[PDB]
Amino acid sequence: MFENITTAPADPILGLADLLRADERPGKIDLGMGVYNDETGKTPVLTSVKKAEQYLLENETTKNYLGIDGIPEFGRCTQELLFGKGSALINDKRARTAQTPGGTGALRVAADFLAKNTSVKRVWVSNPGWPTHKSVFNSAGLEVREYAYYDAENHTLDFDALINSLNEAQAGDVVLFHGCCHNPTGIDPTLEQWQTLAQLSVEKGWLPLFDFAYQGFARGLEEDAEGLRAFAAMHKELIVASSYSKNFGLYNERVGACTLVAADSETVDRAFSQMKAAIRVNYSSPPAHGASVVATILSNDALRAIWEQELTDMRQRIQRMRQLFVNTLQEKGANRDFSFIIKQNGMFSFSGLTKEQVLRLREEFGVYAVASGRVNVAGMTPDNMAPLCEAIVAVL
Amino acid sequence: MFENITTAPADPILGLADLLRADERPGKIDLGMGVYNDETGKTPVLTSVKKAEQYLLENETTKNYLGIDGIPEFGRCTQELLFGKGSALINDKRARTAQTPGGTGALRVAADFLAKNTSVKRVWVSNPGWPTHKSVFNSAGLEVREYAYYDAENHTLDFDALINSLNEAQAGDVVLFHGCCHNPTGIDPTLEQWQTLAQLSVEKGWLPLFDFAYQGFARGLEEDAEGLRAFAAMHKELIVASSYSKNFGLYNERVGACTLVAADSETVDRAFSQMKAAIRVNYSSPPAHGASVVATILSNDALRAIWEQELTDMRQRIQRMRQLFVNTLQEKGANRDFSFIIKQNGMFSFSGLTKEQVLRLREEFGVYAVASGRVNVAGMTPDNMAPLCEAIVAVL
């Protein structure tokens, strides 16, 4: 049965991990996957999380299955975090959230759901974007189209080209927007632009799908949701897939959520049943540990205070590295000006290097980045900055 | 987009939980889902697991993503547990295991894998069987056929009808076998019958797919795999989906595995790449906590000793309840003879009650079982035995 099975192509992102664990060259630099690092170059377990794990270890009395949609508390707090304390969607009870295995699992679920319960036939993703997006919706049987977004020449968001790109989008089509910290450009729409988009969205009859994996890394928790809330204020329906992998550093515990919004509670409940059906034939119930941690923290004033401060420290350290990166390049004899990199927010920065330059960086200097030229700023420490900037200056 | 979405039908098994959490009638008895209970009627966290969680809490330094296939140690130990210490499949390196989110998630993955990388078009499941099996393979686009298995009149395994049932099975077809503790009959093939089936399997060109969710609940860890190992000794290819939800009591942490076997390491590796591709577009990486616990326990002589004793206690308590159940029915004026229930192994017993009798049990006595008449013996305690047997005797 498996005689003629073809070897699968490597994942442009996860595949980097493999090449790293096969390269001896001591002194490598990992700027690939979007995982946070501290001054040490370690991806530590947040303190709030450890204290939360401590709590669960002492108070858990059973591992009995969770309901298909996960921990109820987790969902409520996820909803407050996205829409805001006194959001109408909550008061009107127009939102239903399912705890899912990571932000990727949420997209998988949203995709399976749409494919077989609605008439959606196309999904519009951005270019440049996150490759996995296409792969996930394609595996669900949906076709993927792309819309313009980045101005490679001025290192900014080409709103005109975006609008003209989405004119070809028909009503009933899904449009996927990155909540904040766009991957990989790091360029997000301004509030005024989100408003114009929310307005445009309604008028064209698009189904908004927000992918929220970096809430808290741009400016702040509440600030980073302005875009989403702008849409949420004008739409009857929308889907939000969020992740807690980054802002909680719970990468391997797979904590995410899929939120569904409808006109009224009667509709969202009816639709939510089909989402749960979609989940049951996949993994059945979501993993408890990771989400339990998140709920424990968010519901405990003390623990939440600590967590919010830890998130702030991560956001700030990345900002420091972003500035240290630019300066070091100039100081090291950088060819062009990389000042635009300060404008970008999040863990990534679209360097602008070519596929060959990136290929040469890992081949000759052991510096690993994604072929697209995307580099993980959160992977830069004061210790690797120099060798890192010298190699980049050597391939320019 | 969601205006006309139809309300999904309730799951015959998980749906019971819902009706339970909506019934006030104090004194209810839950004999639905296959979750273990102690004398108290509680589903406690095993001690070995707590000690293991203790260890991780003190030794984990990062939550950084696991590889797509999960924790390497977990896989090795899962393989030893299934095939045996000195198995050839291991020495020859013909097996690859992917840590998955539960035994259900493993089936989902095996299904997605088969659907788009092999020519498999049909899957043969048993009747009676586990309803989710059909739902999972159907969602993957594969068609599901059924083969005879239970002799409702003699409460035994109708081997003749099974063989004649599978004659209609074409080569390249998948046949799903329950490793042990068949759900729901509790009737498993004898070693001689497994051998005859393994032999028949090869000759017809079927692709064996074992679902192993109750390893350790029939007779013992090594004994319960005799069937699987009988097949493994004659096949070049096969798939094993196992769960650790029951024998480790890790239900909500979603710990399972999908093992793939091929003729040689070159083939299994090539095929495994496509399985990993299948996983990446689903949930990306598996949840760490649950599997970390399992690996920690299995790799630690001390902790393993404790665990094996806890598994033995569960197996024995179920056996005691099974005997206490029969006696209490006679003693309470039972109509027919239920001695056949002692022959069944595992958490479930196929009572033989009709859909109406079962419907009346929950309606008038607050006793919950699955419409098929399947009851969770592991849910019976010395305290609920009486009211439980009196209600059953009242609907006979």
Ligand SMILES: *Cc1c(COP(=O)(O)O)cnc(C)c1O
């Ligand atoms: C990290 C990320 C996700 C989701 O990651 P999970 O690990 O599955 O939670 C989704 N979208 C983007 C753009 C991301 O960067």
Ligand SMILES: *Cc1c(COP(=O)(O)O)cnc(C)c1O
């Ligand atoms: C419990 C069970 C499974 C898998 O359960 P998970 O919770 O997904 O690990 C699979 N097959 C049968 C027959 C089962 O009883």
